Design a protein around this ligand. Structure first.
Ligand SMILES: Nc1ncnc2c1ncn2[C@@H]1O[C@H](COP(=O)(O)OP(=O)(O)OP(=O)(O)O)[C@@H](O)[C@H]1O
Ligand SMILES: Nc1ncnc2c1ncn2[C@@H]1O[C@H](COP(=O)(O)OP(=O)(O)OP(=O)(O)O)[C@@H](O)[C@H]1O
Ligand SMILES: [As]
Ligand SMILES: [Mg+2]
Ligand SMILES: [Mg+2]
Length: 570
């Protein structure tokens, strides 16, 4: 592998959801650890699959992997990091001062800004602090889908700029934040990210046009930020030998070859590596030790997705949130549902809270009765700033208004603006269908505001029912959990369902999308994949889900109104 030659200290793995970031990260960390180096595999994804891949319980603590010596693992959980940050800030001042002031500080540190800054502080502490990670020669960062990994990588520069612009009194974080001490750490993280000799950025993708476009956009933005040298990995390439004497495999191979030959011009210069498709899930050391190296070489009748759309229509109005793991087909299924509902003569609003929206790509047309929209972080941040200035800024004097605007310029207000837009869009589901494609599980769970941190942060600025009061009502919401027939996707879907039920939301249905089992595959590799997928399909049908639909692996990517509406009614 080209990206494994003379690796720098750090190695990020960024790309669209479900492209193989975690699999490649684990394989590379295992390879380096076996080579003799001491590696630390950090997972910045809030919903990390590292523990499920290695079969070890990994939390917000550096836990060695017993199976492979010299390798340690870490998962940056935002909640645990926020709790540790709050403890560090409050415990030293507890007892000395009365309970009133200390509890006030605790309440002021209980917002979403505190969680975000705690996770970011842990990330930059890993990046910069040499003593903390001196024992590890390599740190392998396995990131979430690029929609939020780009934000994470931009956060050091944004915070350094905010602090260097004479802004040390962000009232969102509270007076006890003391960000002035972390200015040097933020600048060091920025320098490390922009130094090709210290950090290597690997852009994982697939032989699909959407993933390659996403990686091209990510490469453009990250090159703008300051990362110089980047590599490219194309995961999940069907071997050419499988395309013989098989319609589905031949179509997939033709599409993937066409995608490779039309790689974006910006990514044509990056050093490229190709990882084939394997007849097994990449879970465990046995499967992970043969991921980066080329391998030396069913009658399923499940419920369709038409029943789900019929049930959704029967209500006549409400919200339909397509949650699930990244890369499972949330956008495609949301677009298909919206297109089918609009084609029936009903008013539909199709929205996407993903910071990297892919709605206009999967729709490609202005359908009748369908209103497409997205939660653009920058526009929402603007709108939030003007709203706060108009509401609260009227009373303040000129100097107070300027100070309030400088406070609102802090990077963390973007997430509160996004939450405000999300709540406003949800409030529109009382009279018309609102199909909301979501981001991956890790950040969507934070967006739902189960703990009320976002609501507290909003009402602190003083600029009405919470979103949870609607997602908890089965009569005006439907949370469809989209998963694949694979091990890790089903495990993460079950974890998402458990979290939702803990929060009070009962998912309406499950969708096993792009299952080779549903389709008829004759190549040995795809037959092995279907055989492996049968067990997960059975698990989802019997245990996890009482209402579900199975969508096969279409031989042509569903794009446009016609293809999107075809998978609803095969
Ligand atoms: N039934 C299907 N048959 C074949 N390909 C499919 C099918 N459903 C989805 N795909 C492919 O899955 C790819 C994944 O992109 P998609 O937007 O659907 O996923 P997502 O879960 O929204 O991703 P992200 O986590 O990156 O936001 C799409 O490019 C589409 O080509
Ligand atoms: N080369 C490959 N061959 C076969 N299966 C693969 C390959 N690469 C990845 N997979 C499968 O992809 C599934 C999802 O990949 P992975 O766990 O790497 O997701 P991810 O990129 O971390 O996504 P997310 O951002 O949604 O967490 C895994 O179950 C693994 O089985
Ligand atoms: As803030
Ligand atoms: Mg991952
Ligand atoms: Mg999507």
């Amino acid at each position: 592998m080209k990206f494994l030659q003379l690796p720098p200290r750090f190695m990020f793995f960024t790309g669209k959801g479900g492209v193989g970031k975690t699999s490649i990260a684990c394989a590379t960390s295992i390879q380096l650890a076996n080579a003799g180096k001491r590696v630390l595999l950090v997972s910045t994804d809030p919903a990390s699959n590292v523990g499920q891949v290695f079969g070890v319980d990994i939390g917000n603590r550096v836990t060695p992997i017993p199976a492979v010596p010299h390798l340690s693992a870490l998962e940056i959980d935002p909640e645990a990091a926020a709790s540790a940050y709050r403890e560090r800030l409050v415990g030293p001042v507890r007892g000395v001062l009365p309970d009133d002031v200390v509890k006030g500080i605790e309440e002021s540190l209980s917002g979403a800004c505190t969680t975000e800054i705690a996770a970011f502080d842990e990330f930059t502490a890993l990046l910069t602090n040499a003593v903390l990670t001196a024992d590890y020669q390599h740190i392998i960062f396995d990131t979430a889908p690029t929609g939020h990994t780009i934000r994470l990588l931009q956060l050091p520069g944004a915070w350094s700029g905010f602090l260097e612009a004479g802004k040390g009194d962000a009232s969102c974080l509270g007076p006890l934040a003391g960000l002035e001490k972390q200015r040097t750490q933020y600048k060091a993280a920025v320098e490390a990210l922009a130094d090709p000799l210290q950090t290597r950025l690997v852009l994982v993708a697939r032989a699909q046009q959407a993933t390659l476009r996403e990686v091209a956009r990510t490469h453009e933005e990250l090159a703008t930020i300051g990362i110089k040298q980047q590599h490219l990995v194309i995961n999940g390439i069907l071997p050419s030998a499988e395309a013989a004497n098989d319609p589905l495999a031949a179509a997939i191979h033709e599409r993937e070859q066409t995608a490779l030959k039309n790689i974006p011009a910006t990514l044509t210069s990056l050093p490229r590596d190709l990882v084939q498709l394997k007849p097994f899930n990449l879970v465990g050391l046995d499967a992970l030790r043969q991921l980066l190296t080329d391998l030396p070489l069913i009658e399923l009748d499940e419920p369709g997705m038409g029943d789900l759309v019929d049930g959704i229509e029967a209500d006549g109005h409400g919200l339909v949130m397509l949650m699930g793991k990244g890369g499972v087909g949330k956008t495609t299924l949301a677009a298909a549902i919206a297109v089918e509902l609009a084609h029936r003569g009903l008013p539909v609003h199709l929205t996407t809270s993903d910071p990297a929206a892919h709605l206009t790509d999967t729709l490609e047309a202005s359908l009748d009765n369908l209103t497409v929209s997205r939660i653009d972080p920058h526009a929402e941040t603007e709108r939030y700033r003007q709203h706060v200035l108009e509401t609260k800024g009227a009373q303040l004097d000129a100097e107070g208004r300027a100070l309030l605007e400088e406070d609102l310029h802090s990077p963390c207000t973007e997430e509160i603006a996004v939450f405000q837009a999300f709540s406003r869009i949800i409030r529109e589901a009382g009279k018309k269908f609102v199909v909301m494609d979501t981001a991956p599980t890790g950040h969507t769970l934070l967006l739902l505001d189960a703990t009320g941190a976002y609501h507290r942060e909003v009402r602190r600025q003083m600029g009405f029912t919470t979103p949870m009061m609607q997602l908890r009502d089965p009569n005006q919401t439907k949370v469809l959990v989209v998963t694949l027939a694979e091990t890790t996707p089903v495990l993460e879907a079950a974890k998402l369902q458990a979290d939702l039920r803990r929060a009070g939301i009962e998912p309406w249905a499950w969708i096993i999308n792009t299952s080779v089992a549903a389709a008829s595959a004759k190549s040995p590799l795809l037959r092995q994949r279907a055989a492996n997928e049968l067990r997960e399909i059975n698990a989802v049908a019997n245990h996890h889900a009482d209402r579900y639909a199975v969508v096969p692996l279409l031989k042509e990517e569903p794009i446009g109104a016609e293809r999107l509406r075809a998978l609803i009614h095969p």
